[PDB]
Design a protein around this ligand. Structure first.
Ligand SMILES: *[C@@H]1O[C@H](CO)[C@@H](O[C@@H]2O[C@H](CO)[C@@H](O[C@@H]3O[C@H](CO[C@H]4O[C@H](CO)[C@@H](O)[C@H](O)[C@@H]4O)[C@@H](O)[C@H](O[C@H]4O[C@H](CO)[C@@H](O)[C@H](O)[C@@H]4O)[C@@H]3O)[C@H](O)[C@H]2NC(C)=O)[C@H](O)[C@H]1NC(C)=O
Ligand SMILES: *[C@@H]1O[C@H](CO)[C@@H](O[C@@H]2O[C@H](CO)[C@@H](O[C@@H]3O[C@H](CO[C@H]4O[C@H](CO)[C@@H](O)[C@H](O)[C@@H]4O)[C@@H](O)[C@H](O[C@H]4O[C@H](CO)[C@@H](O)[C@H](O)[C@@H]4O)[C@@H]3O)[C@H](O)[C@H]2NC(C)=O)[C@H](O)[C@H]1NC(C)=O
Ligand SMILES: *[C@@H]1O[C@H](CO)[C@@H](O[C@@H]2O[C@H](CO)[C@@H](O[C@@H]3O[C@H](CO[C@H]4O[C@H](CO)[C@@H](O)[C@H](O)[C@@H]4O)[C@@H](O)[C@H](O[C@H]4O[C@H](CO)[C@@H](O)[C@H](O)[C@@H]4O)[C@@H]3O)[C@H](O)[C@H]2NC(C)=O)[C@H](O)[C@H]1NC(C)=O
Ligand SMILES: *[C@@H]1O[C@H](CO[C@H]2O[C@@H](C)[C@@H](O)[C@@H](O)[C@@H]2O)[C@@H](O[C@@H]2O[C@H](CO)[C@@H](O)[C@H](O)[C@H]2NC(C)=O)[C@H](O)[C@H]1NC(C)=O
Ligand SMILES: *[C@@H]1O[C@H](CO[C@H]2O[C@@H](C)[C@@H](O)[C@@H](O)[C@@H]2O)[C@@H](O[C@@H]2O[C@H](CO)[C@@H](O)[C@H](O)[C@H]2NC(C)=O)[C@H](O)[C@H]1NC(C)=O
Ligand SMILES: *[C@@H]1O[C@H](CO[C@H]2O[C@@H](C)[C@@H](O)[C@@H](O)[C@@H]2O)[C@@H](O[C@@H]2O[C@H](CO)[C@@H](O)[C@H](O)[C@H]2NC(C)=O)[C@H](O)[C@H]1NC(C)=O
Ligand SMILES: *[C@@H]1O[C@H](CO)[C@@H](O[C@@H]2O[C@H](CO)[C@@H](O)[C@H](O)[C@H]2NC(C)=O)[C@H](O)[C@H]1NC(C)=O
Ligand SMILES: *[C@@H]1O[C@H](CO)[C@@H](O[C@@H]2O[C@H](CO)[C@@H](O)[C@H](O)[C@H]2NC(C)=O)[C@H](O)[C@H]1NC(C)=O
Ligand SMILES: *[C@@H]1O[C@H](CO)[C@@H](O[C@@H]2O[C@H](CO)[C@@H](O)[C@H](O)[C@H]2NC(C)=O)[C@H](O)[C@H]1NC(C)=O
Ligand SMILES: *[C@@H]1O[C@H](CO)[C@@H](O[C@@H]2O[C@H](CO)[C@@H](O)[C@H](O)[C@H]2NC(C)=O)[C@H](O)[C@H]1NC(C)=O
Ligand SMILES: *[C@@H]1O[C@H](CO)[C@@H](O[C@@H]2O[C@H](CO)[C@@H](O)[C@H](O)[C@H]2NC(C)=O)[C@H](O)[C@H]1NC(C)=O
Ligand SMILES: *[C@@H]1O[C@H](CO)[C@@H](O[C@@H]2O[C@H](CO)[C@@H](O)[C@H](O)[C@H]2NC(C)=O)[C@H](O)[C@H]1NC(C)=O
Ligand SMILES: *[C@@H]1O[C@H](CO)[C@@H](O)[C@H](O)[C@H]1NC(C)=O
Ligand SMILES: *[C@@H]1O[C@H](CO)[C@@H](O)[C@H](O)[C@H]1NC(C)=O
Ligand SMILES: *[C@@H]1O[C@H](CO)[C@@H](O)[C@H](O)[C@H]1NC(C)=O
Ligand SMILES: *[C@@H]1O[C@H](CO)[C@@H](O)[C@H](O)[C@H]1NC(C)=O
Ligand SMILES: *[C@@H]1O[C@H](CO)[C@@H](O)[C@H](O)[C@H]1NC(C)=O
Ligand SMILES: *[C@@H]1O[C@H](CO)[C@@H](O)[C@H](O)[C@H]1NC(C)=O
Lengths: 173, 317, 317, 173, 173, 317
């Protein structure tokens, strides 16, 4: 949420995109398509796996400890034993609550960041050949067939090739 | 005419709700549970060495109540005490029972070496009807009940040094006779006393003539004490009556051993983390099964569930 | 010509300074205090049941020092002990006073059931000049001072079983006579002894002949002990002299009860959190009023103030 | 601070804006005005209320504990009782300090984010009809009366209506 | 990493820049040069010093405590003493681990933010006189000698001076 | 033609690896160590007042074993006990040795005021061959060994009130004779007893006739007890034999004092934080040197190293 892409200027997610987390939809002369972006998807996934590696399978061995249940009333020493354990559990419970709340805020923000970076990267790529429609979509002011769209997704789009065509379309009356 | 290129992200039809810093209910595409909240119900016998106490408490196995004879010299990573347990030898108490139980549990062995004490001036091996071993009046296997020799009882004075490289653990006791029908019968005089000392320590105890409420039909009691003797040190037993004597020493070790109260059955399976409810897996960092644990375990917390997001915010189509 | 459109944010003339990760002094538009640092100075009598000890300690109300007669059978969520309190009955001590105080506090009731003990072979109801009740030599209401019957004192042997479903709590004691002017007067012999036992436990005590420094003009002492008797179990009192006997048992409960030392007055108000300084509100998550608390309370921390920002950075015009 | 709007490219706040946290000032043919943006204001406010709901009114009940003051010298057991309590208080004091420092950094950053998102949203809206002056203000290259300014604030501004007028003003000599 | 400048759209760092953390490289008629930006460098440095001031030289005095090593076997009370200390050390060890992991994530992100803000500030400054090449570099569509480059670095660049020259270069065929 | 302007950031040839939330190995331009892991090996004698026990335990210096005579009335912030220490006076034990040691350590002074007790009816100043002071049979400097006067020993009854504004600390004891060769020689009768009481407290002790295993050739023992007497209160010593009496009281203070076990040498240097391994600097917030510390110290953690990034991510050229 903190970057403004996911649940912000991108109206909603795509349930039909099942082979990636982020990607592209286009409309051109040859039809309407969709392709996943692997690099941004893998960036988000690696970061979340990084968090998982810190939390899953990382336990601590403990052996002989203090007693934690009692069948007789004893006073002072039993009070202290119960108090120590109750103190400890509240501190760990606090740690677990805070951890999840913070990690979750950060997971939501990093994933929004990855969407935003891909959008930004794509905008720079298009130079003067397109305009931002404000909803995550670019209007491209030149004929851009499937190979051309593929060139943008693959980072091989040469903006000089189309620039005369696009400037002429952009600054008409 | 041109083209349109739209950047976007996935969404799923089945999102999950998580907590965040700014919102207690946000839907994400996916999450994983961080609190383990279930056991299979059985204590796995691997990879920790489990000793099922069955009918015996650790203390009964230590003293050597006949039904616990199979426990002699056994070791454990974890001794399991059952709620169905009961004593069936001579009635007794242990002042600071909890500490003796703890230090034996933690030592993790019942290894016992017999020792030849110079007991002359008394009858050794006293027995009773309340401690039936092999269908015959008997006593605690690791104790030696000492009574008179021909209407007399002189001042005992027995010595035993520790030349070993481990702490020796000596278990011993006092008999408290029900009336004067067993104060003039097994000890031959009005009064008694026991003094078990070392170079660094001294413990002395007075026998107590008096009737107690019956426990399996016996109204006398024994009281159990203990003494640790280090390398280079010596044990002394001055006694003028009533001594419940050691037959030797227990080895005390240090390591990972402990004790747990549980009625869960022992299973033939492998699990690092044991609770009183049974073994639990330890993939998750936290657990709400039991504050009592043994092994590589998740940490106990009060919460039932804590969901960690493993995907972006879900914004359905 | 055209137009100009400027995006912007608010600011205030009265900003507040907060701490952050990267700067110990940043001004924000608004903040709220997370540490509660004040009390009204009174303990609110709601919603917890408060029992003001006034001149009485819990222990004096328990034993039944005459000025504490109004406390008989009362319950409490929180018993408040005052610094002005004092004893005005027979001088006494309690070995492990702190534990008895704690376990009664936590039980949260003084409910006492009287019991008929077979006291024949002694004079019951001994009194003294140091325990004035209704302008007449008296004693602790829950104790029964036992002395001789006609220059003699035989071996007592009284039994009382617990058929109830709660733990019974028995309070009892020993008299320690100042000289031989009260060792041959109330007990009729040279020596004495007391043995209060159960199926699981035994406590025995020797009376002590000797002068003590006077406490309200009396140089003898009593020593107070206690015994918990569970369901199915029995209490036995073997005695050959000097017994300060129970008149019955206290019920021991479990729940939320406790005890607090405070001189704050009790107010007619409603507050969930009590400290020794008085009640405090519990809106804030933290507090620096007192490490001692009772109820739904903020957590004690060392800091005086912790300001949480509730607005943006303030950047004045 | 982390997005660069508040105490960055926006020189300062507006003490005269009392009905919102974020908003618009304009100069046009009809004068100079100000209007608050409710959506961005409410976004920031909801997030801060989210933090408040986690921290205010959420206490823990405790009843019988250990003693924490003592009138007699006793040694070992009293040392342990005091130590347990001192240990506990230091851990909670640490938790409270860290909580406030982190939440405060995050509150400052989220509020800066909301300013930045509104700015960004407004820039996309204007398409080729305006330029960013670098101080949070746009130079709009067409006649934009009060209704036009209102259309931008309300998200109903139609950029095609003014585009010929604006391109002609923008690319003059 | 969360803003996408450092280890993102800027391919790599400059080992040859030894007098600042952030800065400028140019190519023009008069050659190829480098100058550090002090303000952005000092912004990042102050924030990291802020973290240091919270962590360095801030210790707690403790005096008489409990014993933590034992030469004799004792049971119950010794178990509790050892347990209290082991509990405490695990909680502090947890605090130290989490602190470093969070502060380090945040240091990496704030430094990336400072790069991004400088880039953004420079882009707005250039108005219609340059285009973003997508790798942190701007193509400037006018003669821009050493004094002109200096004017951009110093925030005194007047974009109107070059705008006719640049528009003409930008929208050629 | 135009120009090109590139924005960028620095990098270094020698980066350092740090941990983050999302990656356990990220290289940054620079980092600093947060865990202190080394000591110089010496305890700095400033700015805390250090008292090197050398051959003496705190308890030996307290009782006044002749080799500890130089410690009389000294104060300390930190008393250092050496592993080479040993006792060389009369053999003794202290029930709850750890508590007496702790409360003296914490008091931080050995200030002793002598007091004139009315000892008539006994021989004061008993000595022995096992406590050699100035090449002459002697005893513990702060104790007064009390024996008979002409084949007799009447009932002692000595009183001493505390009119001061500090707690008085009284150290006293019992002799336990090896046989009846030193039960009829120094006390002139079959039996003995000691009762040290106050307005609030009473402690009584029975001497124990019996042989112990020799410790520096002596088979008798003393047992050491203590009594705190507050302002307005009084000390009473009733005794019928065997008393090891105080010569006065220790002042008990409160403050920052403690005790530490260490063999590290004392250096002439200035360091706020002391561990048993030596002083350590306290610039860093954490340390893995020792869980035992004294002074303004970093907090003990299990980790060896924790690197905090102090620069951006390093992305080499
Ligand atoms: C929602 O989010 C979660 C977390 O990101 C995803 O769940 C993980 O999915 C992966 C891949 O399917 C799982 O990886 C597998 O781990 C197995 C180990 O099982 C136990 O141990 C782990 C901890 O290590 C516990 O968390 C877990 O509950 C188990 O008790 C391995 O046996 C698997 O190996 C198999 O596949 C690999 C293929 O690479 C082969 O090499 C092997 O031969 C073998 O066949 C595998 O490594 C991971 O365990 C899951 N984690 C959790 C916490 O559940 C969900 O996939 C995701 N959901 C969606 C829809 O995206
Ligand atoms: C600076 O920042 C703080 C925090 O964001 C703001 O203070 C909050 O302001 C709101 C609205 O004025 C307050 O809401 C009110 O809460 C009352 C409960 O009072 C006690 O309990 C709360 C916890 O629940 C304690 O924090 C508080 O100190 C009190 O002890 C209610 O009684 C109020 O109800 C009244 O108004 C509502 C209108 O919606 C009606 O429904 C009711 O009938 C009734 O008349 C109200 O809900 C909130 O308590 C404040 N919080 C704190 C922590 O102080 C400041 O407003 C802000 N300053 C500026 C200038 O913006
Ligand atoms: C990698 O990152 C670290 C941390 O940002 C940098 O190390 C710091 O560098 C500064 C400046 O060189 C150091 O500041 C100096 O502190 C000295 C105090 O020394 C002790 O105390 C500190 C805590 O206060 C400990 O951390 C430290 O280890 C020492 O034990 C002062 O004596 C210095 O004063 C001298 O210089 C100043 C100039 O301003 C003069 O005023 C004085 O007269 C005197 O000559 C100085 O203030 C700081 O101590 C370092 N911190 C740490 C934690 O190491 C590295 O510089 C950085 N590396 C690179 C390549 O950038
Ligand atoms: C562990 O003990 C059980 C229970 O046996 C005892 O139960 C006590 C309450 C008491 O009545 C005591 O006298 C009794 O011996 C043993 O199971 C019992 O074994 C007896 C004799 O073999 C059988 O007659 C019963 O069927 C059986 N009872 C029950 C309820 O199972 C059990 O043998 C023993 N286990 C081990 C491993 O020693
Ligand atoms: C609680 O006790 C107070 C104090 O009374 C006692 O003070 C002791 C120090 C000691 O001197 C003792 O002998 C004395 O009785 C009671 O207040 C006192 O009550 C007496 C008798 O009614 C009055 O003469 C006094 O005015 C009054 N003194 C003070 C200082 O107030 C008080 O009655 C009692 N409270 C309850 C609820 O029982
Ligand atoms: C602290 O004591 C040491 C050691 O002295 C004692 O060692 C015991 C094990 C035991 O044998 C005991 O009888 C012996 O006295 C003192 O050092 C020793 O001092 C003696 C007499 O001056 C010398 O003959 C030795 O050289 C010397 N031995 C060693 C190993 O150093 C030391 O003097 C004393 N220190 C202080 C400050 O009092
Ligand atoms: C003290 O009292 C108990 C209880 O009355 C006596 O124990 C009982 O004695 C009878 C007959 O001798 C036994 O058959 C019972 O088993 C016992 N009853 C209970 C309830 O335990 C005890 O003997 C008495 N003490 C003396 C010295 O006679
Ligand atoms: C594991 O066992 C514990 C201990 O018996 C269970 O917790 C108890 O549950 C009972 C019945 O619900 C309550 O009356 C007790 O108050 C609980 N005791 C404690 C100490 O919390 C627990 O429910 C079991 N857990 C699982 C997952 O089976
Ligand atoms: C032991 O000594 C105390 C103190 O001297 C005696 O108690 C005093 O006795 C006198 C006269 O008998 C009383 O009037 C005082 O009240 C007491 N004084 C104090 C200060 O308490 C005590 O009686 C002596 N013991 C014996 C057996 O005589
Ligand atoms: C609440 O009461 C406590 C306990 O009396 C106060 O803390 C004490 O304050 C006195 C006088 O300032 C100091 O001499 C003590 O050292 C303090 N004791 C402790 C244990 O900290 C506290 O000031 C009171 N708080 C309020 C808000 O009234
Ligand atoms: C009890 O036994 C011990 C050990 O045998 C006796 O102490 C020994 O006595 C001899 C000769 O009297 C001494 O020379 C030795 O030094 C002692 N040996 C050891 C190993 O300590 C002790 O005297 C006996 N008790 C009685 C009353 O005679
Ligand atoms: C400081 O001293 C401690 C205590 O002796 C050292 O920790 C012990 O190290 C030995 C030998 O490596 C181990 O056998 C012990 O198990 C350790 N004890 C404990 C309690 O951890 C420690 O290595 C020393 N540290 C430094 C930096 O010198
Ligand atoms: C969503 O549905 C799939 C298929 O039924 C399932 O495997 C997956 O775990 C579900 N995910 C969540 C987060 O509920
Ligand atoms: C006592 O019993 C043990 C074990 O059965 C036996 O070896 C020993 O000879 C007996 N002792 C005597 C003195 O009869
Ligand atoms: C600022 O001033 C107003 C009006 O005097 C006051 O109500 C408000 O609480 C103040 N805010 C802060 C944060 O000081
Ligand atoms: C002892 O006093 C109680 C209470 O006043 C009374 O009921 C009882 O009869 C007395 N007992 C005897 C034996 O006189
Ligand atoms: C890198 O090298 C310099 C010069 O050798 C050194 O002073 C500096 O501390 C090094 N930095 C790191 C982070 O290793
Ligand atoms: C006991 O010794 C001390 C110290 O040497 C001395 O002052 C005192 O006079 C002696 N006491 C008697 C009664 O001789």
């Amino acid at each position: 949420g903190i970057f403004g892409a996911i649940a912000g200027f991108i109206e909603n997610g795509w349930e039909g995109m099942v082979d990636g987390w982020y990607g592209f939809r286009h409309q051109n002369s040859e039809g309407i398509g969709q392709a996943a972006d692997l690099k941004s998807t893998q960036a988000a996934i690696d970061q979340i796996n990084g968090k998982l590696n810190r939390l899953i399978g990382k336990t601590n061995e403990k052996f002989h400890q203090i007693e934690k249940e009692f069948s007789e009333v004893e006073g002072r020493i039993q009070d202290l034993e119960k108090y120590v354990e109750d103190t400890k559990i509240d501190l760990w419970s606090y740690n677990a609550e805070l951890l999840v709340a913070l990690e979750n805020q950060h997971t939501i923000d990093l994933t929004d960041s990855e969407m935003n970076k891909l959008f930004e990267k794509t905008k720079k790529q298009l130079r003067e050949n397109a305009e931002d429609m404000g909803n995550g979509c670019f209007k491209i002011y030149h004929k851009c067939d499937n190979a051309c769209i593929g060139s943008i997704r693959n980072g091989t789009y040469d903006h000089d090739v189309y620039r005369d065509e696009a400037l002429n379309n952009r600054f008409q009356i | 005419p041109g083209a349109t290129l739209c950047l976007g992200h996935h969404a799923v039809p089945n999102g999950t709700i998580v907590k965040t810093i700014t919102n207690d209910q946000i839907e994400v595409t996916n999450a994983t549970e961080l609190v383990q909240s279930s056991s299979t119900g059985e204590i796995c016998d691997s990879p920790h060495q489990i000793l099922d106490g069955e009918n015996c408490t650790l203390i009964d196995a230590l003293l050597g109540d006949p039904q616990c004879d199979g426990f002699q010299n056994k070791k454990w990573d974890l001794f399991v005490e059952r709620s169905k347990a009961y004593s069936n030898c001579y009635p007794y108490d242990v002042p600071d029972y909890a500490s003796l139980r703890s230090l034996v549990a933690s030592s993790g062995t019942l290894e016992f070496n017999n020792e030849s004490f110079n007991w002359t001036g008394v009858t050794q091996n006293g027995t009773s009807s309340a401690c039936i071993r092999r269908s015959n009046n008997s006593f605690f296997s690791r104790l030696n009940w000492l009574t008179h020799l021909k209407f007399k009882y002189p001042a005992l004075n027995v010595t035993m040094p520790n030349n070993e490289k481990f702490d020796k653990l000596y278990i011993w006791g006092v008999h408290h006779p029900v009336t004067d029908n067993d104060q003039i019968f097994p000890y031959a005089q009005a009064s008694g006393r026991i003094t078990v000392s070392t170079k660094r320590s001294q413990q002395t105890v007075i026998p107590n003539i008096g009737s107690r409420p019956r426990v399996r039909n016996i109204p006398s009691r024994i009281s159990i004490y203990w003494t640790i003797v280090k390398p280079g040190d010596i044990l002394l037993i001055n006694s003028t009556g009533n001594l419940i004597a050691p037959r030797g020493y227990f080895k005390i070790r240090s390591g990972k051993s402990s004790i747990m109260r549980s009625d869960a059955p022992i299973g033939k399976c492998n699990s690092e983390c044991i609770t009183p409810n049974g073994s639990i897996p330890n993939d998750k960092p936290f657990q709400n099964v039991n504050r009592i644990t043994y092994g590589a375990c998740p940490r106990y917390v009060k919460q039932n569930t804590l969901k960690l997001a493993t995907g972006m915010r879900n914004v359905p189509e």
